[PDB]
Design an enzyme around this catalytic site. Structure first.
Site, short mmCIF file in Angstrom:
data_model
loop_
_atom_site.label_atom_id
_atom_site.label_comp_id
_atom_site.label_asym_id
_atom_site.label_seq_id
_atom_site.Cartn_x
_atom_site.Cartn_y
_atom_site.Cartn_z
N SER A 141 0.79 -1.20 0.00
CA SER A 141 0.00 0.00 0.00
C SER A 141 0.84 1.28 0.00
CB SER A 141 -1.07 -0.06 1.08
OG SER A 141 -0.45 -0.25 2.33
N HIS B 106 -2.25 -8.78 1.30
CA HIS B 106 -1.94 -7.59 2.05
C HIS B 106 -2.95 -7.38 3.16
CE1 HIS B 106 0.02 -3.77 3.07
NE2 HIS B 106 -0.34 -3.03 2.02
N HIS C 188 5.47 -12.96 6.68
CA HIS C 188 5.73 -11.57 6.44
C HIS C 188 6.86 -11.41 5.44
CE1 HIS C 188 6.37 -7.29 7.01
NE2 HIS C 188 5.07 -7.29 7.27
N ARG D 182 3.13 -5.83 16.57
CA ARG D 182 1.77 -5.30 16.48
C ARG D 182 0.79 -6.37 16.97
NH1 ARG D 182 1.68 -3.26 10.37
NH2 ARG D 182 2.54 -5.40 10.18
N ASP E 40 -2.29 -8.97 11.14
CA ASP E 40 -3.66 -9.26 10.75
C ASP E 40 -4.25 -10.44 11.48
OD1 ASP E 40 -3.20 -8.40 7.21
OD2 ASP E 40 -3.80 -7.11 8.93
C1 LIG Z 1 2.81 -12.16 3.75
C2 LIG Z 1 3.44 -13.07 2.68
C3 LIG Z 1 2.91 -12.67 1.28
C4 LIG Z 1 4.94 -12.90 2.53
O1 LIG Z 1 5.25 -13.48 1.24
P1 LIG Z 1 6.78 -13.94 0.88
O2 LIG Z 1 7.79 -12.90 1.35
O3 LIG Z 1 6.91 -14.17 -0.64
O4 LIG Z 1 6.90 -15.29 1.79
P2 LIG Z 1 7.99 -16.41 1.97
O5 LIG Z 1 9.29 -15.78 1.55
O6 LIG Z 1 7.92 -16.99 3.37
O7 LIG Z 1 7.47 -17.50 0.90
C5 LIG Z 1 8.11 -18.80 0.73
C6 LIG Z 1 6.96 -19.78 0.44
O8 LIG Z 1 6.20 -19.93 1.72
C7 LIG Z 1 4.79 -19.70 1.42
N1 LIG Z 1 4.15 -19.12 2.65
C8 LIG Z 1 4.50 -17.91 3.27
N2 LIG Z 1 3.54 -17.47 4.07
C9 LIG Z 1 2.57 -18.41 4.00
C10 LIG Z 1 1.29 -18.50 4.69
N3 LIG Z 1 0.88 -17.68 5.63
N4 LIG Z 1 0.60 -19.64 4.41
C11 LIG Z 1 1.10 -20.63 3.61
N5 LIG Z 1 2.20 -20.56 2.90
C12 LIG Z 1 2.89 -19.45 3.12
C13 LIG Z 1 4.87 -18.68 0.32
O9 LIG Z 1 3.59 -18.65 -0.30
C14 LIG Z 1 5.87 -19.39 -0.57
O10 LIG Z 1 5.26 -20.44 -1.21
P3 LIG Z 1 5.70 -20.58 -2.82
O11 LIG Z 1 7.29 -20.80 -2.81
O12 LIG Z 1 4.92 -21.81 -3.49
O13 LIG Z 1 5.29 -19.30 -3.69
C15 LIG Z 1 3.21 -14.58 3.00
O14 LIG Z 1 3.72 -14.90 4.30
C16 LIG Z 1 1.72 -14.91 2.96
O15 LIG Z 1 1.11 -15.14 1.79
N6 LIG Z 1 1.05 -14.66 4.07
C17 LIG Z 1 -0.39 -14.87 4.16
C18 LIG Z 1 -1.15 -13.56 3.84
C19 LIG Z 1 -0.98 -12.58 4.98
O16 LIG Z 1 -1.15 -12.92 6.20
N7 LIG Z 1 -0.65 -11.37 4.62
C20 LIG Z 1 -0.43 -10.21 5.60
C21 LIG Z 1 1.07 -9.88 5.73
S1 LIG Z 1 1.50 -8.57 6.88
C22 LIG Z 1 0.11 -7.51 7.24
C23 LIG Z 1 -0.63 -7.02 6.01
O17 LIG Z 1 0.09 -6.75 5.07
O18 LIG Z 1 -1.92 -6.75 6.02
#
Ligand SMILES: CC(C)(COP(=O)(O)OP(=O)(O)OC[C@H]1O[C@@H](n2cnc3c(N)ncnc32)[C@H](O)[C@@H]1OP(=O)(O)O)[C@@H](O)C(=O)NCCC(=O)NCCSCC(=O)O
Ligand SMILES: CC(C)(COP(=O)(O)OP(=O)(O)OC[C@H]1O[C@@H](n2cnc3c(N)ncnc32)[C@H](O)[C@@H]1OP(=O)(O)O)[C@@H](O)C(=O)NCCC(=O)NCCSCC(=O)O
Lengths: 429, 429
Positions: A243, A273, A316, A325, A371
């Protein structure tokens, strides 16, 4: 002589910073701060040092800092309504200026954001005609786009002011935007969930959070405190988050603050997000449908994973430890709603999720983010319309992204426009 | 057996690419492709290799390439309506697939984009109630946000599909979006400029450009050719430009294609970006108010500069030579509207501006970009409502950003989330 005016302080601050960044660059502009790899490029700029964003800096281990102030420090240092939680007003002062405000400064933001909160008739119109199946984040983002009619910056530009003064009109539009936000947000609330009711009037004598909870219709005095806390902690989270970065990118092209905030919202609305807000509740809501065992809890988590979904609220891009948080929020529940069964489920999940996520071996950060804990708080107070939560995130977020937006234009940051490359191209490189 | 279907081709293409990018990364992910300096960070990522974006690549000297196809190559290779200009339909095929389409492929896009072009009642409503002082780009962006109601991807996600299939729903929403665009754009046109008139029906038998010029109300047969050319050349311009990058950023968070396009628009609306369209005309419009001498022309240019404004239509973040799109447009004028006095002024400006810009010593690229030449074309055909031009850019741009959006999700590109830093922080580093 005289009394309070954030704009006058800013006028004093801008030149010094300007000066400060010029020399630093004069000596260090050539300095290599990092390298870029193929993986970074295919990987979402993960790990790339790409932006300067002054209001907040996130540490992978400690979590977010407002000056260099942690959340716990803010909790203690920012002024309160009377009466335990920090006023987002104060946070705003802090972000903008670098300094902790006095009560009296803070009362000025309140009065100011009250004076400015007025919605034009075309906007009230659109919001009233919107369908109820149109998502609240959608409704919000369209409304803020539609407000650009009123942009002071958009008008000034049109007139051809000199670049130097941009920051000045950006600040007016930022203070106006922040002022209006709760009115738009509440009108959406009222329309969707409280049909036939009216948001009422803004009382110049209350703080922004309280006027908001009034327009929402909540009376509980602890809810008001939850609100103040919520909007403060959700403020800002450095520049690279979707954002904030979107607003920074859009604003760099000279789109007024209204337009840049709106696009910011389209980014906050993404499931990865801020929509996580909402996703968490829904996922809890399913969970309960299908007082359970850790083992049944664990089966559930697996089935999400096995299905190619994410477990919302965990993980994250930068943090590598539990989000403060999250803690911040837990500590609020423990004080106020410790027997809440939804609370208890979230406490229990913290015991399992990370473990399951470590087991799976994919998430680089298995701990929960803001979240995971925010909706549970809202639900307790009666605010159970989950598809609405992200709006509230939208509201807070405005404090940080607008506080920075003003600095960007003040420092004259140019068009954000990196180079891309195609796979074929990179293959060749 | 069977007939045409872009989705089936894509289904065949996705795995191969997937495979292709995995090995490349397996061997080269660690490879340093570049460094990052302080100046880059304070400078808008200028010069930073930050994104992978496959549909187009911009060369600093040669200008944009669709596969590796230049504009002149496209001009010759893409199919035409009968009858000299390339169909944006074909361009779309090309971007998506990497290959030059056959007439018959191309006719399929047309028929398909005709079948899909339908506007929901809430959207028609809002557009009809909008104020006439609400900017057309604003009106457009709110409308596309409001369309998210209908997102096939947003719905699928909600249902919890597996990540793997994201690309599939993104493609449906992309084809639908592209289909609807001209209807929204024309309804805005008609409302603001042709009060009481109606956009009429889409004729499945025409090409997208022609249906558009119909809904706009233009009959001139050369206008139709201008349109086809316009929407093709404005298609895509690599990934780092503000609009494309915004869609890429927002889409990375899993916001459906509607939301990501809309934010894209808020970025296109910035004066330093697509609004330049409009800024150019207005600046010409002033110029004429105040057949002049090169010397008087030069005084005028100076006074803009001296006033802390930019000269619109000149300069570029990456190009270092005259934009081929500019050329492309000049060559169209020379054929069709060579005696146009507005044309002649733009020709004359090309003689002076660069020189004045070299004189001043600030612009790294003193040559004109696409925007310097596009409005002059429109005006000639009777389309003189300048505040509307950027809408048309908005329409074309959808072809490139959506064509890529589909690939991103197909290749599984993750959250875009770089690290930021504050000045204090960097000072310390
Ligand atoms: C927030 C994230 C997008 C960070 O993404 P990233 O930096 O690319 O994560 P990473 O480096 O740990 O990813 C390595 C692998 O672990 C997977 N992984 C990471 N977090 C998750 C999760 N919560 N559930 C399942 N798998 C996950 C990720 O999808 C990836 O899989 P692939 O290699 O097939 O694409 C991810 O943790 C996720 O999708 N979280 C769930 C959604 C969420 O809770 N978002 C809020 C984040 S912070 C507050 C906000 O922004 O509102
Ligand atoms: C397009 C640009 C933003 C590129 O920005 P950039 O990469 O930061 O430019 P640069 O590296 O040449 O800038 C060096 C200096 O020259 C200045 N300069 C560059 N272009 C111009 C211009 N057309 N008029 C006057 N000064 C200019 C630039 O503002 C900067 O001044 P300062 O150091 O005080 O901030 C800039 O050329 C400009 O503002 N152009 C005018 C707006 C315009 O025509 N935009 C359309 C660009 S391409 C098509 C589109 O996107 O719609």
């Amino acid at each position: 002589a005289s009394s309070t005016n954030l704009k006058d302080v800013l006028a004093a601050l801008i030149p010094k910073e300007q000066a400060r960044i010029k020399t630093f660059r004069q000596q260090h502009g050539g300095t290599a701060l990092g390298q870029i790899t193929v993986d970074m490029s295919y990987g979402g700029m993960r790990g790339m040092k790409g932006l300067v964003y002054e209001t907040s800096v996130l540490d992978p281990d400690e979590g977010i800092r407002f000056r260099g102030f942690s959340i716990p420090e803010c909790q203690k240092l920012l002024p309160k309504g009377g009466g335990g939680e920090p006023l987002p007003e104060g946070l705003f002062w802090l972000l903008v200026t670098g300094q902790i405000p006095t009560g009296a400064q803070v009362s000025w933001l309140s009065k100011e954001w009250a004076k400015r909160a007025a919605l034009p008739s075309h906007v009230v119109t659109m919001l009233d005609n919107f369908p109820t199946n149109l998502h609240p984040m959608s409704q919000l983002s369209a409304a803020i786009t539609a407000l650009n009619s009123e942009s002071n910056f958009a008008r000034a530009y049109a007139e051809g002011i000199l670049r130097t003064k941009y920051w000045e009109m950006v600040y007016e539009s930022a203070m106006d935007l922040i002022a209006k936000l709760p009115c738009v947000a509440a009108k959406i609330y009222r329309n969707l969930y409280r049909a036939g009711s009216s948001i009422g009037a803004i009382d110049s004598k209350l703080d922004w959070s309280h006027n908001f909870t009034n327009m929402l219709g909540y009376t509980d005095a602890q809810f008001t405190e939850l609100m103040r806390l919520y909007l403060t902690i959700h403020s800002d989270h450095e520049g690279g988050n979707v954002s904030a970065h979107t607003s920074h990118l859009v604003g760099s092209a000279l789109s007024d603050p209204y337009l840049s905030f709106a696009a910011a919202m389209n980014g906050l609305a993404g499931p990865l997000h801020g929509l996580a807000n909402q996703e968490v509740l829904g996922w809890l809501a399913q969970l309960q449908k299908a007082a359970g065992a850790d083992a049944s809890l664990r089966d559930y988590i697996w089935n999400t994973l096995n299905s190619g979904r994410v477990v919302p609220g965990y993980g994250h891009a930068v943090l590598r430890k539990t989000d403060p948080r999250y803690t911040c929020q837990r500590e609020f529940a423990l004080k106020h709603l410790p027997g809440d069964p939804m609370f208890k489920l979230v406490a229990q999940l913290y015991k399992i999720v990370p473990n399951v996520l470590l087991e799976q071996g994919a998430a680089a950060n298995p701990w929960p983010n803001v979240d995971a804990h925010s909706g549970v708080l809202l639900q307790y107070y009666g605010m159970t319309e989950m598809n609405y939560y992200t709006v509230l995130f939208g509201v807070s977020r405005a404090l940080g992204v607008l506080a920075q937006l003003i600095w960007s234009r003040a420092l004259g940051f140019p068009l954000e426009r990196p180079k891309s490359m195609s796979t074929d191209g990179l293959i060749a490189l």
